[PDB]
Design brief:
The structure is a homodimer. The first copy, chain A, is an alpha+beta fold. The first copy, chain A, contains 8 helices and 13 strands. In chain A, the strands form 2 sheets. Chain A has a 7-stranded antiparallel beta sheet, with no helix packed on it. In chain A, helix 3 (201-213) runs parallel beside helix 8 (293-301) and helix 4 (227-236) runs parallel beside helix 7 (261-274). In chain A, 46% of the residues are buried. Chains A and B meet through helix 1, strand 9, strand 10 and helix 8 of A and helix 1, strand 9 and strand 10 of B.
C-alpha cells in the first residue's frame, strides 16, 4: 500500500526527444515518424517574442535554418510547416523508436506526466494536473520549451501537452500537439491573465477515497449532503462545482470503500468549513487535487504498461 | 521556474526490469549483463514468509524452477545463488539494454527514484527519501517486490534500493543491490520496529532555499542563530542535528541566494516554534524534507541525462 504522486514511466517518450535549434534559440522537439514537433517560437529571438508576427518570421526561414539533433546524430529537415502554435519539421528519418501514439486534447482537472527536457535530453519526470484555468504548476527552466506531457495506456502514448511559456506569474502554459493553446494564452512575451484558479473538487474526493483505502479515516463523518448544498459550500471556497458526471466517475471508489459519493462530499464540506485542525491526510496538510479518480484506481490496482 | 518533486527519467531502468516466477510467487527482477537480481523471498509461499529458512528453501530449487521473462522473451536460467537477501540468477544472455551502472548504498536522508513494477512491467515512477530510520514511504502493492530505486548521473545508473516488504505499519523496507537491508529489518513477515523517524533537517533547509529562489520569502526573518542553538531547538522538534558537513553541502545555495545557512536556520527555528500558522511554502502546508541540496541545485540548473 501507500499512495504517492506518481508519473508514468518515461522511456517511450525519452526515445522521442530531440534538440531543435533555430539561430540563437534551442529548445526540445518531439520526433514521431518523420516529423519533429516543437514550439513555433523557436524561430523567435528574445526581442521577437515581445510582438512576433509568426508568419512573417517563418517565411524568413528555410529547412536548413533548423538544426535538429537526436543524440549525436543530426536529422535532415526536408520540410517545415506551422500548425497553430507548433512547427512540424519533416525530417528524412522516421524515428525508429516511435511508440504507438495519439494526440489528445485533455480537459481541466485531468492529469498527465511531464518529461522535462533541456537541449533534447530528458531531465526529470513528474505528474501535473491541468488547472481549471488551463495553466499547469510545473518546473520549467529556460530551454524546457517543447517538453511534453503525456499519459500511457499499456503501449500507446497519448501526448496531450507541449510546454511553450512561463507566464509573468511563474505558472506555465502550453498547447496540445496540434498547437492549440490550452486556455486564453498566446505565444507572445506580454502580460497575460490566467483566470482565477479553482480547486478540482472531483480530484480531491478521489484522493480522500485514496486516503480511506490507505487507512486515513479520521475525516470521515456519518453526515451526508445533497449535491446542491455541497456545491453551495464548494463555491464559497473556490471549489469547482461537482456534477453528476463527477459522481458517476467516483462510482467505483464509492463501491470499493462502501462510502457513498455524497457521504464523502459531506466529509469534504466539513473539512472546508472546519479546516484540517493540524492533522494530515496521506501525509499532506492541504487537500490534494492532482489525482484523478482514474489515477487513484490505477495506483490502487497496479496497472502496468 | 517552479519546483516539483521530480523523478529521474526511467527509460534506462525500464529496459532492465524482468519478471521472475518461482513456484506460485511472481515478482520483479533486475537484469544487468547476464545476471538477474531479485528478492530472495521469491522462493517463499505466503506461509513460508512467516518464518522462512532461506538456505533450506533454496536447496530445494533448481535453475529450471526459476522462470525469468523479459517482455515476451524467455530467459534461460543457468545458475542461481543467494547473496544476503537477494537471489542472483545467472541467465544465458546478457541484457543488451544494460546501462552503465553501479550498485551504491545510500545514506539516510538521500533521495532516489523508484520505478514501481508489477509482473516485470513498469507501472509508475516517483521520488523517495531514505528516512532517518531507514524506511521509505513508497507505493508498493502486492507484486511490487524487486522494484528498484536509483539515481542517474548523465549516463550511469546508480542502483541503490530494491524493494522487499511492507512493515505492518505501512512503511516499506528493502535492501541495496548486494542484498543488505537498509535498517534493522529482515525478510520475514513479523512485527518489526522501525526507529523513531526524524525530519531531515538539511533537506528542509535546502527546500527553504528552493522556496526563496522561487520567490517564497515570507518566512525569512533577519535573525541569525548558532549551530548549537539551532540544534537545541532541532532536537526538541525531532529534527536531525545539523552538522558542519550539512552547512558545507548548503554552501552553493547559500551563495546563490545571499542567505547564510545560519540565517536560514534562524528562519527555520522560528517556523518550528511558531508553526506555519496555516501559511504555505512552495504550495505545501508542511516543511518538506524529501529534497536533498543536490536535488534543489539540480532542479534549479537543469541537469540532463
Amino acid at each position: 500500500s501507500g499512495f504517492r504522486k506518481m508519473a508514468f514511466p518515461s522511456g517511450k517518450v525519452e526515445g522521442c526527444m530531440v534538440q531543435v535549434t533555430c539561430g540563437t534559440t534551442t529548445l526540445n522537439g518531439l520526433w514521431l515518424d518523420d516529423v519533429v514537433y516543437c514550439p513555433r517560437h523557436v524561430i523567435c529571438t528574445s526581442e521577437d517574442m515581445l510582438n512576433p508576427n509568426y508568419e512573417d518570421l517563418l517565411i524568413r526561414k528555410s529547412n536548413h535554418n533548423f538544426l535538429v539533433q537526436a543524440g549525436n546524430v543530426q536529422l535532415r529537415v526536408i520540410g517545415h510547416s506551422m500548425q497553430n502554435c507548433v512547427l512540424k519539421l519533416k525530417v528524412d528519418t522516421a524515428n525508429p523508436k516511435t511508440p504507438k501514439y495519439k494526440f489528445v486534447r485533455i480537459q481541466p482537472g485531468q492529469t498527465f506526466s511531464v518529461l522535462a527536457c533541456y537541449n533534447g535530453s530528458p531531465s526529470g519526470v513528474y505528474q501535473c494536473a491541468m488547472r481549471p484555468n488551463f495553466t499547469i504548476k510545473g518546473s520549467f527552466l529556460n530551454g524546457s520549451c517543447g517538453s511534453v506531457g503525456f499519459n500511457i495506456d499499456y503501449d500507446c502514448v497519448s501526448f496531450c501537452y507541449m510546454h511553450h511559456m512561463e507566464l509573468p506569474t511563474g505558472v506555465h502554459a502550453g498547447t496540445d500537439l496540434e498547437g492549440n493553446f490550452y486556455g486564453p494564452f498566446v505565444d507572445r512575451q506580454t502580460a497575460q491573465a490566467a483566470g482565477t484558479d479553482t480547486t478540482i473538487t472531483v480530484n480531491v474526493l478521489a484522493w480522500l477515497y485514496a486516503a480511506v483505502i490507505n487507512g486515513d479515516r479520521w475525516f470521515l463523518n456519518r453526515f451526508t449532503t445533497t449535491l446542491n448544498d455541497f456545491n453551495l459550500v464548494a463555491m464559497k471556497y473556490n471549489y469547482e462545482p461537482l456534477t453528476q458526471d463527477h459522481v458517476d466517475i467516483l462510482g467505483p471508489l464509492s463501491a470499493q470503500t462502501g462510502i457513498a459519493v455524497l457521504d464523502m462530499c459531506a466529509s469534504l464540506k466539513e473539512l472546508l468549513q472546519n479546516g484540517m485542525n493540524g492533522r494530515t491526510i496521506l501525509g499532506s496538510a492541504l487537500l490534494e487535487d492532482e489525482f484523478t479518480p482514474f489515477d487513484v484506481v490505477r495506483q490502487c490496482s497496479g496497472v502496468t504498461f
